[PDB]
Amino acid sequence: GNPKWERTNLTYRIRNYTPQLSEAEVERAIKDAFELWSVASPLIFTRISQGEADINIAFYQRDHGDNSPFDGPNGILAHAFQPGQGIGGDAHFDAEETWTNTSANYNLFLVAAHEFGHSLGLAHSSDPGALMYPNYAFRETSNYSLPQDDIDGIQAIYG
Numbered sequence: 001g002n003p004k005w006e007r008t009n010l011t012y013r014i015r016n017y018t019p020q021l022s023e024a025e026v027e028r029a030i031k032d033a034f035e036l037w038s039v040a041s042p043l044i045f046t047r048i049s050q051g052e053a054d055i056n057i058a059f060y061q062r063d064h065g066d067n068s069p070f071d072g073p074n075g076i077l078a079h080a081f082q083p084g085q086g087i088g089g090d091a092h093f094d095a096e097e098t099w100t101n102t103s104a105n106y107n108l109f110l111v112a113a114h115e116f117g118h119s120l121g122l123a124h125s126s127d128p129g130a131l132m133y134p135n136y137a138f139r140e141t142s143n144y145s146l147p148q149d150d151i152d153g154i155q156a157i158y159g
């Protein structure tokens with residue numbers, strides 16, 4: 001339905017952490033993941049440590065109150081809701097995963113980056129090179145930039 005945010009400065013909050021990474025590694029992964037979309041659009045992402053952000057980020061297991069349960073290790077890594085009020089925009093990560101910042105399954109930055117596409121209103125692409133491809137695979141992250149198909153997608157929505 002072409003659901004999109006109607007402001008360019010959006011806020012986010014990290015509500016909890018996974019045990020497999022320092023808080024600063026989680027924080028860094030989320031920040032970089034938002035930055036990939038920011039360098040390609042008018043969107044500006046601002047962190048809050050509490051209170052009511054546009055995008056809540058959380059790690060949960062199995063049933064977690066939104067009627068799309070997670071499934072234990074592998075399979076669904078994360079999900080995220082389309083722009084909108086309330087749960088709109090929020091991104092949940094399967095606490096049962098191995099979460100890394102290395103080439104080993106699963107790179108938290110890469111999964112967040114994909115999820116935030118969904119959070120900003122993108123659907124999946126059929127382009128096997130795109131971030132918004134429906135399946136995960138690791139790609140070099142040390143200066144990962146948005147693939148051109150995903151630049152096209154975010155620009156199509158937000159300029």
Ligand SMILES: Cc1ccc(-c2ccc(CCC(=O)N[C@@H](CCC(=O)O)C(N)=O)cc2)s1
Pocket residue numbers: 075076077078079080110111114115118129130131132133134135136137138139
């Ligand atoms: C370098 C990359 C290119 C593409 C990457 C990617 C692709 C897909 C994911 C999520 C993979 C995932 O968890 N998919 C749920 C649906 C939720 C959703 O679509 O977000 C399922 N299996 O049903 C994470 C990362 S990483």
Ligand SMILES: [Ca+2]
Pocket residue numbers: 070071072073074075076077094096097
């Ligand atoms: Ca899972």
Ligand SMILES: [Ca+2]
Pocket residue numbers: 053054055056084085086087088089090
């Ligand atoms: Ca929200």
Ligand SMILES: [Zn+2]
Pocket residue numbers: 064066068079092
């Ligand atoms: Zn959820």
Ligand SMILES: [Zn+2]
Pocket residue numbers: 114118124132133134
């Ligand atoms: Zn997806």
